[PDB]
Design an enzyme around this catalytic site. Sequence first.
Site, mmCIF file in Angstrom:
data_model
loop_
_atom_site.group_PDB
_atom_site.id
_atom_site.type_symbol
_atom_site.label_atom_id
_atom_site.label_comp_id
_atom_site.label_asym_id
_atom_site.label_seq_id
_atom_site.Cartn_x
_atom_site.Cartn_y
_atom_site.Cartn_z
ATOM 1 N N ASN A 10 0.849 -1.173 0.000
ATOM 2 C CA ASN A 10 0.000 0.000 0.000
ATOM 3 C C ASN A 10 0.899 1.241 0.000
ATOM 4 O O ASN A 10 1.498 1.589 1.009
ATOM 5 C CB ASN A 10 -0.967 -0.038 1.196
ATOM 6 C CG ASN A 10 -1.827 1.189 1.291
ATOM 7 O OD1 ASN A 10 -1.823 2.044 0.398
ATOM 8 N ND2 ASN A 10 -2.552 1.331 2.436
ATOM 9 N N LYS A 12 0.133 4.261 -0.265
ATOM 10 C CA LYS A 12 -0.520 5.378 0.413
ATOM 11 C C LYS A 12 -0.400 6.609 -0.484
ATOM 12 O O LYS A 12 -0.518 6.476 -1.701
ATOM 13 C CB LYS A 12 0.048 5.559 1.816
ATOM 14 C CG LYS A 12 -0.147 4.297 2.631
ATOM 15 C CD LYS A 12 0.038 4.494 4.129
ATOM 16 C CE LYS A 12 -0.172 3.154 4.868
ATOM 17 N NZ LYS A 12 -0.115 3.365 6.358
ATOM 18 N N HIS A 94 -9.569 0.701 5.350
ATOM 19 C CA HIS A 94 -8.256 0.855 5.929
ATOM 20 C C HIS A 94 -8.383 1.812 7.097
ATOM 21 O O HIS A 94 -9.189 2.756 7.079
ATOM 22 C CB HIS A 94 -7.277 1.375 4.894
ATOM 23 C CG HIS A 94 -5.856 1.411 5.361
ATOM 24 N ND1 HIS A 94 -5.293 2.500 5.999
ATOM 25 C CD2 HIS A 94 -4.879 0.481 5.283
ATOM 26 C CE1 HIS A 94 -4.034 2.244 6.284
ATOM 27 N NE2 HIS A 94 -3.750 1.027 5.859
ATOM 28 N N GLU A 96 -6.804 4.311 7.922
ATOM 29 C CA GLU A 96 -6.748 5.752 7.649
ATOM 30 C C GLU A 96 -8.096 6.281 7.188
ATOM 31 O O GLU A 96 -8.484 7.380 7.598
ATOM 32 C CB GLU A 96 -5.599 6.137 6.698
ATOM 33 C CG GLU A 96 -4.228 6.114 7.413
ATOM 34 C CD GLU A 96 -3.102 5.477 6.606
ATOM 35 O OE1 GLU A 96 -3.184 5.461 5.358
ATOM 36 O OE2 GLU A 96 -2.091 4.995 7.214
ATOM 37 N N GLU A 164 -4.945 -5.387 10.992
ATOM 38 C CA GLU A 164 -3.971 -4.326 11.160
ATOM 39 C C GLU A 164 -4.212 -3.633 12.501
ATOM 40 O O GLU A 164 -5.065 -2.751 12.570
ATOM 41 C CB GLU A 164 -4.171 -3.338 10.017
ATOM 42 C CG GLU A 164 -2.922 -2.856 9.359
ATOM 43 C CD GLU A 164 -3.050 -2.560 7.871
ATOM 44 O OE1 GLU A 164 -2.119 -3.001 7.177
ATOM 45 O OE2 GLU A 164 -4.019 -1.870 7.423
ATOM 46 N N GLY A 170 2.475 2.318 10.859
ATOM 47 C CA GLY A 170 3.382 3.411 10.627
ATOM 48 C C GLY A 170 4.183 3.839 11.830
ATOM 49 O O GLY A 170 4.894 4.849 11.762
ATOM 50 N N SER A 210 3.686 -2.292 10.450
ATOM 51 C CA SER A 210 5.135 -2.244 10.573
ATOM 52 C C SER A 210 5.855 -3.552 10.221
ATOM 53 O O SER A 210 6.805 -3.943 10.912
ATOM 54 C CB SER A 210 5.541 -1.746 11.964
ATOM 55 O OG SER A 210 4.946 -0.468 12.196
#
Lengths: 247, 247
Positions: A10, A12, A94, A96, A164, A170, A210
Amino acid sequence: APRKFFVGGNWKMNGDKKSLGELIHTLNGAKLSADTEVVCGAPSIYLDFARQKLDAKIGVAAQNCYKVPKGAFTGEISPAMIKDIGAAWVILGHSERRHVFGESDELIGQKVAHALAEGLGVIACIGEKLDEREAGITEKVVFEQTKAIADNVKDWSKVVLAYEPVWAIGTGLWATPQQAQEVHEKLRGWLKSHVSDAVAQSTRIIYGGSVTGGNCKELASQHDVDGFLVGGASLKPEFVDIINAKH
Amino acid sequence: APRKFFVGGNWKMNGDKKSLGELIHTLNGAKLSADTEVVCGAPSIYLDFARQKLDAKIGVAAQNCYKVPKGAFTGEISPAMIKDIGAAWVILGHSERRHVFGESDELIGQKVAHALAEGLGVIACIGEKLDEREAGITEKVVFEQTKAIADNVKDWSKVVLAYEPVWAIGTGLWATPQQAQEVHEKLRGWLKSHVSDAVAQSTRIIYGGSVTGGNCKELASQHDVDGFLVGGASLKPEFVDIINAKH
């Protein structure tokens, strides 16, 4: 019979033509395992470019879509557009999108149903926040998010589930192999009881949060982790190492 | 002195390569007035395609962007990416962004500052809902939405304001020429009092909300209506007529 190992990248909101071009050149030239299914999730503006340049054996995913084929939704793209440029996957739900842009489980579920009806594969993301984990409620959260998706899936053959932990995205903190395996085996048992045994045995459940070249072998060796969704490291040459985590 | 007439087409979430290809061929083939500045807002996934195929006198706009150049924002694109493919504008604060997707005034203001900093032009949308117009508070709502944008603007030379009453978008209802002139005139007097005379005199204020081939000439004739943002009719051959509204 065994589930094919699956690695998604991904990107991003990163890249330009030059830099993404270089990354793709690298991936095309690498020795990637014959037994890993690889998908790269490009920014929407670069989907067409990415599909043109990438080896056909490598899939292309959108990073989001909306829930109808066309209409008055300024700034959105539909599954019909994704299929039109030759992408075969979309990432939905996701972290985000949920926590920065406010996308609800009900919205995500409608997106999943629409993507599947149009013939796309879905990487559907779930995960708990730190405060939820520390309150003992990981199972509750993860099952609630999964039900919202499952209630909108009629054909499981083009679904991949991505677990996740939000606190792992991140940040450089990754779930231990034992943390990941716990959740993945519980998710698989959820699929067995609420859907079917065949679906539990066949559906990839991948870990994200990560993942790097340094930790991927240990995570990959866990019995119910079928692969990874990779963010930061998918923009680096070590992505190749992650694709080949089983070798 | 006076202001160049400006017509933007917002394609929203419509099209595929074949269908937009035929639309671009029509626009390139048409006799478009040299005194109209024209911009087409394409879906992000077709922005590169559209700029490659459209004649250079027609500008290309993205339909939305985010407020930093790169980062962990799955599903978003930045001005740097928009610039990379050669588009020169972005539409920000569209009613569909504010009301379907919940984008706030403060967020839209930070997006405006960033797109301007990165060398893009901005088409910045404001507008009142039906319940606000009926309550008699149109002016209050547009002046607050405008203040949000303006506090983030240092160089007005690359900004176009678009007044679009929410109730007129996609429905077929259009503001009367007198209603549109009234608002545009009030917006211009607000730019005079809070920015400067020269900015007031130079800034295009365009109208959107169910502009068609049939009403464009009556609308364009009003003194402070400097053009149009067109949605539905922008996918149709009458778009050429709207571009040519003054002739």
